[PDB]
């Protein structure tokens, strides 16, 4: 198990333009292509992030690029953000997994906010950290699978993934 991997179940895999949980235009791996409300502009985001004439539709090569740009983009996004890079560097290569997995979801401003609880990761204050990072949006819009990313802070273990 990765973070690879471990993000690719969360996420799922559609090679045509859908609706995220929030009702957003997203396309493959978790891909966020807008905010907007019009169709229309999600299809243009979609051919300049591709760079061709999609019409919605993907294949699993172009899908899996977007993936690789995205899991990069928010690995740099936290080693640049003053309140994300310290606790990153405390942890090990699972608790790492996990840190990257949300900046993935919700952004690194979003994570950044989480102000309470990155201070107790940081002082590996495991138990304390699970029950902080439960009281949030993030946790009463998608349960599941914040309750796994949770048990990754609270274990060290790839435990909630493995028996998938
Ligand atoms: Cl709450
Ligand atoms: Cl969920």
Same mark, same amino acid.
């Given at each position: 198990?990765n ?13 045509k /333009?859908?609706?995220? #949980? @929030? ?5 493959g /791996?978790?891909?966020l292509?807008?905010? +907007?409300? +019009? ?18 539709? /993907?294949?699993?090569? @172009?899908? @899996? ?40 979801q919700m ?9 309470? +609880?990155?201070?107790?990761?940081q002082?590996?204050? !495991?138990? @304390?950290?699970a029950?902080?990072?439960?009281? +949030?949006? !993030?946790?009463?819009? #998608? ?8 048990? #990754?802070?609270? #274990?060290?273990? !790839? ?6």
């Open positions: 198990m973070i690879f991997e471990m993000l690719r179940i969360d996420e799922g895999l559609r090679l /333009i859908y609706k995220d #949980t @929030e009702g957003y235009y997203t396309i /791996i978790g891909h292509l807008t905010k +907007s409300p +019009s169709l229309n502009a999600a299809k243009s985001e979609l051919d300049k992030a591709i760079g061709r004439n999609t019409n919605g539709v /993907i294949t699993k090569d @172009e899908a @899996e690029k977007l993936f690789n740009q995205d899991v990069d983009a928010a690995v740099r996004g936290i080693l640049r953000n003053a309140k994300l890079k310290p606790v990153y560097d405390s942890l090990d290569a699972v608790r790492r997994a996990a840190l990257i997995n949300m900046v993935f952004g690194e401003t979003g994570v950044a906010g989480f102000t309470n +609880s990155l201070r107790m990761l002082q590996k204050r !495991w138990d @304390e950290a029950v902080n990072l439960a009281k +949030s949006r !993030w946790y009463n819009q #998608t349960p599941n699978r914040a309750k796994r990313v949770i048990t #990754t802070f609270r #274990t060290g273990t !790839w435990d909630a993934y493995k028996n998938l």
